[PDB]
Amino acid sequence: KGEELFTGVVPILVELDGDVNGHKFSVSGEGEGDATYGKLTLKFICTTGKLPVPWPTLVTTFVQCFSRYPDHMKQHDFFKSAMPEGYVQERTISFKDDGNYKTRAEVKFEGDTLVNRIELKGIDFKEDGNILGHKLEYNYNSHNVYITADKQKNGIKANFKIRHNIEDGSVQLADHYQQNTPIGDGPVLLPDNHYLSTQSALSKDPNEKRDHMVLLAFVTAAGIT
C-alpha cells in the first residue's frame, strides 16, 4: 500500500527543465513533506541563472501525494495509492489573454525520497504581458483543486482556476487542466468527486543570492460527508 509510505516525514526532490518562448531554464528543488498534516516545506533554486517567468506561475507545477486526506476520505486518495511506482502528471496551464504552459511530470519514489521530474513547455506569451514582463506579486492566494475520476485511463482528472495578483491590483487568471495516470500496473484508488483545499506562503532566504523561492504549503481534502 502507498499510504504507509506517508505516515512520517518524507524527503522531496524536484527537478525541472523548462522552455518558455525560447527561454530555456532549469530549477532544482529540495525539501520535505508530512502528509499527516498535509504540510510541504520546499526550496527552489534556478540553476541556469535568472528565471524568465515569475516564481508564482510555477508553484502548481512544483506532489499532491502530500495532501491530507481525512479518515473518511482515505478510499479516495489516488495519489498515495499509485506509490512507490508513481504517476505521470500532465497539465495545460492557460493564462488568460496570454500564453500557456504544457507540463509532464513523473512523480515516484527513489529510495525513501519522493521525486518529481518535470518538463515544462511554454508558448505564445506576450513579451509585454504579466508573465514575461514580470508584473505579478510574490504571493499566492488560497484555492480549491476539483478532482474527478477517469476510469478509461485508470487515473484522475482535475480542473481549477489560479488567480495571480498583478502589481496594479488586478488579477491574471491561470486555468489548470490536469491528468494523472499510474506508472505501475498495480491497483489504484478511483475517487468520487471532491476537492483539495490549498494554501501557500512564499518567502525569500536572506542569505541566498541565486534566483530562488522558499515555499510553505498546506493541502487538505474535503467535499465528502
Short mmCIF file of N, CA and C in Angstrom, two decimals, residues 3 8 18 25 27 30 33 35 67-68 70 75 84 87 107 110 116 122 130 135 156 174 176-177 190 193 196 202 204:
data_model
loop_
_atom_site.label_atom_id
_atom_site.label_comp_id
_atom_site.label_asym_id
_atom_site.label_seq_id
_atom_site.Cartn_x
_atom_site.Cartn_y
_atom_site.Cartn_z
N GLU A 3 -0.15 4.47 1.11
CA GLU A 3 -0.33 5.37 2.26
C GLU A 3 0.61 5.14 3.46
N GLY A 8 5.12 9.34 8.01
CA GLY A 8 6.13 10.18 8.62
C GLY A 8 6.61 11.28 7.69
N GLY A 18 12.76 23.65 -18.25
CA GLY A 18 11.76 24.47 -18.91
C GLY A 18 12.20 25.21 -20.15
N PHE A 25 15.53 27.08 -19.27
CA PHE A 25 15.92 27.15 -17.87
C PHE A 25 15.78 25.83 -17.10
N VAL A 27 15.46 24.24 -12.91
CA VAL A 27 15.22 24.51 -11.49
C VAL A 27 15.43 23.23 -10.67
N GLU A 30 14.44 21.16 -3.34
CA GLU A 30 14.61 20.22 -2.23
C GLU A 30 13.71 20.60 -1.05
N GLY A 33 8.03 16.76 3.09
CA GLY A 33 6.59 16.80 3.24
C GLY A 33 6.11 15.86 4.32
N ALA A 35 2.50 14.32 5.10
CA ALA A 35 1.11 14.08 4.68
C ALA A 35 0.04 14.04 5.78
N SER A 67 -1.01 15.61 0.25
CA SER A 67 -2.28 16.20 0.65
C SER A 67 -2.80 15.42 1.84
N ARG A 68 -3.52 16.10 2.74
CA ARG A 68 -4.10 15.42 3.88
C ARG A 68 -5.50 14.95 3.55
N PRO A 70 -8.63 13.13 5.03
CA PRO A 70 -9.26 12.73 6.30
C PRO A 70 -9.60 11.24 6.27
N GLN A 75 -10.31 6.38 1.08
CA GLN A 75 -10.58 5.47 -0.05
C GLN A 75 -10.59 6.25 -1.37
N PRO A 84 4.72 2.91 -4.49
CA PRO A 84 6.01 3.52 -4.87
C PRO A 84 6.33 3.73 -6.35
N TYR A 87 3.01 8.07 -10.52
CA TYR A 87 2.11 8.54 -11.56
C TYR A 87 2.75 9.56 -12.47
N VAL A 107 6.17 11.49 -11.02
CA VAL A 107 6.24 11.53 -9.57
C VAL A 107 6.29 10.10 -9.02
N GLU A 110 12.26 7.22 -5.10
CA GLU A 110 13.63 6.82 -5.44
C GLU A 110 14.25 6.60 -4.06
N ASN A 116 9.98 14.34 -8.11
CA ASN A 116 9.11 14.93 -9.13
C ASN A 116 10.02 15.46 -10.25
N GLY A 122 6.47 26.27 -22.49
CA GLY A 122 5.62 27.45 -22.53
C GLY A 122 5.68 28.13 -23.88
N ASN A 130 1.89 40.00 -18.39
CA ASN A 130 2.14 39.86 -16.95
C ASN A 130 3.22 38.86 -16.58
N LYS A 135 5.13 41.18 -13.98
CA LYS A 135 4.19 42.09 -13.32
C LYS A 135 3.38 41.47 -12.16
N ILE A 156 -6.98 9.99 -12.80
CA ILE A 156 -7.84 11.11 -12.44
C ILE A 156 -7.71 12.32 -13.37
N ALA A 174 -5.15 31.92 -14.48
CA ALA A 174 -4.37 30.79 -14.98
C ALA A 174 -5.23 29.55 -14.78
N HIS A 176 -6.18 25.74 -14.99
CA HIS A 176 -5.45 24.49 -14.95
C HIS A 176 -6.31 23.28 -15.31
N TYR A 177 -5.80 22.49 -16.24
CA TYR A 177 -6.44 21.25 -16.64
C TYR A 177 -5.36 20.20 -16.35
N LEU A 190 -9.75 4.86 -7.39
CA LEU A 190 -10.50 5.71 -8.31
C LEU A 190 -11.53 6.43 -7.42
N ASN A 193 -16.16 12.57 -6.69
CA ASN A 193 -15.85 13.99 -6.83
C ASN A 193 -15.59 14.64 -5.47
N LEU A 196 -9.40 19.65 -3.17
CA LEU A 196 -8.24 19.83 -2.32
C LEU A 196 -8.11 21.31 -1.97
N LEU A 202 4.77 32.16 0.23
CA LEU A 202 6.04 32.35 -0.47
C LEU A 202 6.96 33.33 0.26
N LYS A 204 11.55 34.49 0.91
CA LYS A 204 12.93 34.51 0.42
C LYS A 204 13.89 34.14 1.55
#
